Structure 1
Amino acid sequence: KPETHINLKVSDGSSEIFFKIKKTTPLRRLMEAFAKRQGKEMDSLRFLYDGIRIQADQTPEDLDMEDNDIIEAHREQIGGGETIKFVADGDIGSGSVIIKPFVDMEHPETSIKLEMDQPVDLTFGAKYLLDIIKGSSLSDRVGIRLSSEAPALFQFDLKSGFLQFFLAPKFN
C-alpha cells in the first residue's frame, strides 16, 4: 500500500512539535495537543499550512500534504490569511492582482503554496519578468524565492535539473 502515515512539524518559532499520523486523521488532535502545551486555548489560535488557514476538521490528504510538511501557529488575526499582491502603476492607470494560497485536492498541480518567514515588498522590471516567464514552457509550476536583500529566484524544474533566473529588484 501507500505511505499510510506521515510526519509534520508544528511550530510557532520558539516551540515546535513533531507528529506522525495517518493521512486520514483530522488535525484536531495535533492542534489541541500543540495548544495544551502552549498553555493557550485551542481556538485562541490561528493555524496555517503553507499560507492556508486550516481548521481542526481537516485531513492531511485533503491539503495534499507532503512528508515533513509544516503547520504554523499564530495568535488570532484579522483575517482568515496571508496573501500575495502584484501591482503596477503606470501612466495610463494601474493594476492589482491578489492571490490567496489554496489547495484543490481533486487536482493539486494547480494549488498555491506560500512559506512566509518575513513579509516582503519588492519591485522588479516588467521587461525582465517578461523574459523570465518564457520558461513557463518547461514546467507546470514556478518557484519563487524572495529576499529583501538578495536577488529573487525564479525556478522552473525539469526531471533532474532546473532553469533558474536571479533578478535584482529595483531601488525606487
Structure 2
Amino acid sequence: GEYIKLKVIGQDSSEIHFKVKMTTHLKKLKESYAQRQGVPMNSLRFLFEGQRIADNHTPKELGMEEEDVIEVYQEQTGG
C-alpha cells in the first residue's frame, strides 16, 4: 500500500482532492467525482497532462505523483 493525493479541477475551477493508492483503478475516482457533481460519469472526460484517463488506468501506469492535477472537461464533441 502506497497512497497519493490528486487534485481534480473542473470546468468552473473548483477543486476536489482524492487520496488513492498507486494501484487504484481510476474509474473509482471518475465515478466519485461525477457523483459529487451530479452528472453521469460518461458526460465527462478526465485528462492527465491532456491525455484521457481510462477506467483501468492507475496512477502508477500514468506516472502520477503526490499533488498532480487531473482536469475534467465535458465529453466531446463540445468545445
Task: Using structure 1 for the length normalisation, give the TM-score.
Answer: 0.42
Query: Which residue is 1:57 aligned to?
Result: 56
- Structure 1 unaligned regions, length at least 5: 80-172
Amino acid at match of 1:5: Y
Amino acid at match of 2:59: P
Paired residues, what number?
77
- 2:45 and 2:52 map into 1 onto residues whose CA distance is 7
Question: Percent same amino acid at aligned positions?
Answer: 52
- 1:53 and 1:21 map into 2 onto residues whose CA distance is 18
Query: Which residue is 2:6 aligned to?
Result: 8
Amino acid at match of 1:4: E
RMSD: 1.7
- Write out the 4+ residue segments of structure 1 that deviate beyond 6 Å after TM superposition: none
- 1:33 and 1:16 map into 2 onto residues whose CA distance is 13
Query: Which residue is 2:74 aligned to?
Result: 75
Task: Using structure 2 for the length normalisation, give the TM-score.
Answer: 0.87
Q: Greater relative contact order: 1 or 2 (C-alpha under 8 angstroms, separation 6 or more)?
A: 2
- 2:4 and 2:47 map into 1 onto residues whose CA distance is 18
Q: Give the number of the structure whose residues are more often strand, by fraction.
A: 1
Amino acid at match of 1:72: E
- Structure 2 unaligned regions, length at least 5: none
**Residues 109-128 of structure 1: pairs in structure 2 closer than 5 A:** none
Work out which of the two has the higher radius of gyration on C-alpha atoms and give 1 or 2.
Answer: 1
Q: Give the number of the structure whose residues are more often helix, by fraction.
A: 2
